[PDB]
Amino acid sequence: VGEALEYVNIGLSHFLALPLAQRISLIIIIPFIYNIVWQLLYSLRKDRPPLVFYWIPWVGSAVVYEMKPYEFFEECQKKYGDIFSFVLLGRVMTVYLGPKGHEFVFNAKLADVSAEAAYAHLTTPVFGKGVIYDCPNSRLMEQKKFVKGALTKEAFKSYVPLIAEEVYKYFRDSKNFRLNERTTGTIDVMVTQPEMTIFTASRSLLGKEMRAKLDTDFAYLYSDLDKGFTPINFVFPNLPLEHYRKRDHAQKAISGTYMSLIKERRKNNDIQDRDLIDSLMKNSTYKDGVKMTDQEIANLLIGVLMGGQHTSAATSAWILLHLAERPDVQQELYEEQMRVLDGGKKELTYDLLQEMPLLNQTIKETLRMHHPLHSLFRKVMKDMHVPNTSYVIPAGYHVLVSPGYTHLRDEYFPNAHQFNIHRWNNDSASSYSVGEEVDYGFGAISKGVSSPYLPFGGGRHRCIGEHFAYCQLGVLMSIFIRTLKWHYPEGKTVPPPDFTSMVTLPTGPAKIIWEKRNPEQKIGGR
Ligand SMILES: CC[C@@H](C)n1ncn(-c2ccc(N3CCN(c4ccc(OC[C@H]5CO[C@](Cn6cncn6)(c6ccc(Cl)cc6Cl)O5)cc4)CC3)cc2)c1=O
Ligand code: HEM
Numbered sequence: 001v002g003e004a005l006e007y008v009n010i011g012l013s014h015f016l017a018l019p020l021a022q023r024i025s026l027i028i029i030i031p032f033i034y035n036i037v038w039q040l041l042y043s044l045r046k047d048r049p050p051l052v053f054y055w056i057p058w059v060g061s062a063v064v065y066e067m068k069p070y071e072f073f074e075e076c077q078k079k080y081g082d083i084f085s086f087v088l089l090g091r092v093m094t095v096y097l098g099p100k101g102h103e104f105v106f107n108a109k110l111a112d113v114s115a116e117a118a119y120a121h122l123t124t125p126v127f128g129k130g131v132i133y134d135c136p137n138s139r140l141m142e143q144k145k146f147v148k149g150a151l152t153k154e155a156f157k158s159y160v161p162l163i164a165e166e167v168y169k170y171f172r173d174s175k176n177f178r179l180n181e182r183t184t185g186t187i188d189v190m191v192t193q194p195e196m197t198i199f200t201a202s203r204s205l206l207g208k209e210m211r212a213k214l215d216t217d218f219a220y221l222y223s224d225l226d227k228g229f230t231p232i233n234f235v236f237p238n239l240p241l242e243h244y245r246k247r248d249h250a251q252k253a254i255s256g257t258y259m260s261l262i263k264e265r266r267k268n269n270d271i272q273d274r275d276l277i278d279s280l281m282k283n284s285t286y287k288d289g290v291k292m293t294d295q296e297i298a299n300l301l302i303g304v305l306m307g308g309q310h311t312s313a314a315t316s317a318w319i320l321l322h323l324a325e326r327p328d329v330q331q332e333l334y335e336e337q338m339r340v341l342d343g344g345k346k347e348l349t350y351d352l353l354q355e356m357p358l359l360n361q362t363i364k365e366t367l368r369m370h371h372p373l374h375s376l377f378r379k380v381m382k383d384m385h386v387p388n389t390s391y392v393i394p395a396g397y398h399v400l401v402s403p404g405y406t407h408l409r410d411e412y413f414p415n416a417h418q419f420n421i422h423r424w425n426n427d428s429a430s431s432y433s434v435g436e437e438v439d440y441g442f443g444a445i446s447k448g449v450s451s452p453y454l455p456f457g458g459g460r461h462r463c464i465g466e467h468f469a470y471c472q473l474g475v476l477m478s479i480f481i482r483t484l485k486w487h488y489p490e491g492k493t494v495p496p497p498d499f500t501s502m503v504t505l506p507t508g509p510a511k512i513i514w515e516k517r518n519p520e521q522k523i524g525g526r
Helices: 002-016 020-042 062-067 069-080 099-106 115-127 137-148 153-173 189-206 208-213 219-227 242-266 276-282 294-324 327-340 357-369 403-407 466-483
Strands: 083-088 091-096 184-188 376-380 398-401 437-439 444-446 484-487 511-516
Touching (some): 062 083, 091 099, 099 376, 099 398, 115 137, 153 189, 184 189, 189 208, 189 466, 219 242, 219 294, 294 327, 294 357, 466 484
Parallel strands (some): 091 398
Antiparallel strands (some): 184 511
């Protein structure tokens, strides 16, 4: 025995004396073997959900997950059922599929899980400090309350003609259209929709000054900030590269522009009820009496515009793409436009938008087939027991929920891979509570989150943008339909999603051919 402890020591010294080749080689081959041994041992644990096997340590199942998450989830679901874990770039993600998963994660106790712990790197570098996920949850709840106060039915009545003006100006002035000069053309929807989206959301939420800025070199800062919104931040939120410097600069420059306007409006008492800026200036004092700073207000503006930017632009791109191979649906939507707007003799209003059920069902169905966020998650802060199981999810794990996956299951949506707006007949609401409501600080919302359709999530982190998105998308699509027909280049069809970006946008280039329904129609203005 004593002779063996000596040879331990001897073995240590010989190990350290190995050639620099073998030692390097051992450096990688040792934790490769340990990783594999640990997993086999982990599988013996009956209080842990099954863990997807993987070869490369740290990296885990990152490649297959990020490239086709729904295919990954379905294969895992077959082998293990609805609850399973996988390693993702240093983290352990526990996935809970289906409505019970929704309930488990979206309705989890505030003390059990943290969204800001999961997300703050995806957002704080882009938006700025003090808001969204760079603040306690109770602060987020009131920020959501503040933003929601600019998102009223009255606001939407005022936004609808502004959004319409931007769409028509885009049709008139953009090189992608020029409808006064050209009667047919080809566009990349991943070019047009981001532009139309920022033009319409700027004009309505930020106001005319901020909209005007986008006609200048200033627009390039939005591009820079936009490029700083990437899943890469999930791993590398700060790296000494030019990319990261333009982002940080952009955030500074853009928040500075918003603060400049804010300070001017106050130093002119020019504070009204026009836009989200006026609203936050009048209404951004927390319940404990602390006021948001001008910097925090500006940062909150950036976050709200950036969030609405990517979800919405992706969604209208998908709407155009699905309709491009469905002239029957374009036709049905057009007849509804003619009926509700009296053959075009009525001006579009917010109230008339609500009387367009097929148009709204089209948005609704697009959001079913294309949830812009395939995976939502939280960091586990306290050990969680999974009801009706012996599973315990340890703190330090992350939980992942994917309502978009359930959107595409035949059990909940018959022929789920078929685009059919009529599956929503007499059910054209963006969403609704089928029962009890609860209020987390930004208004009463559904207490239950068991709906198999959950494009806007649920619980305390639920979206507050849904009515703005439908308003924006509704106006945009109403004008598209009334103005244009469109179709695919020969042999093209709906592209597959790119699941590696922040949202699940179409893989580009995604081109459609438009043509004017009324070639002689002119769009006025200078
Ligand atoms: C290429 C680098 C490589 C190493 N890498 N490393 C990691 N990844 C990766 C990770 C994850 C993903 N996925 C999953 C996570 N992800 C994602 C998840 C949640 C999310 O947002 C949830 C919260 C925070 O952002 C918003 C988005 N939003 C909601 N409504 C409107 N926007 C949000 C909420 C509120 C506000 Cl004010 C702003 C924002 Cl942006 O909600 C955004 C992206 C989508 C891509 C893909 C690739 C990589 O590609
Ligand atoms: C089709 C359009 C949209 C979809 C499908 C969508 C989806 C979602 C989802 C799923 C969440 C929950 C995230 C989570 O639980 O992890 C969310 C949160 C949120 N979204 Fe949206 N969104 C859309 C548009 C918008 C718009 C237009 C705005 C702003 C005007 C917006 C602002 C917000 C805010 C403030 C939150 C709260 C985040 C939190 O509390 O953690 N969203 N959205």
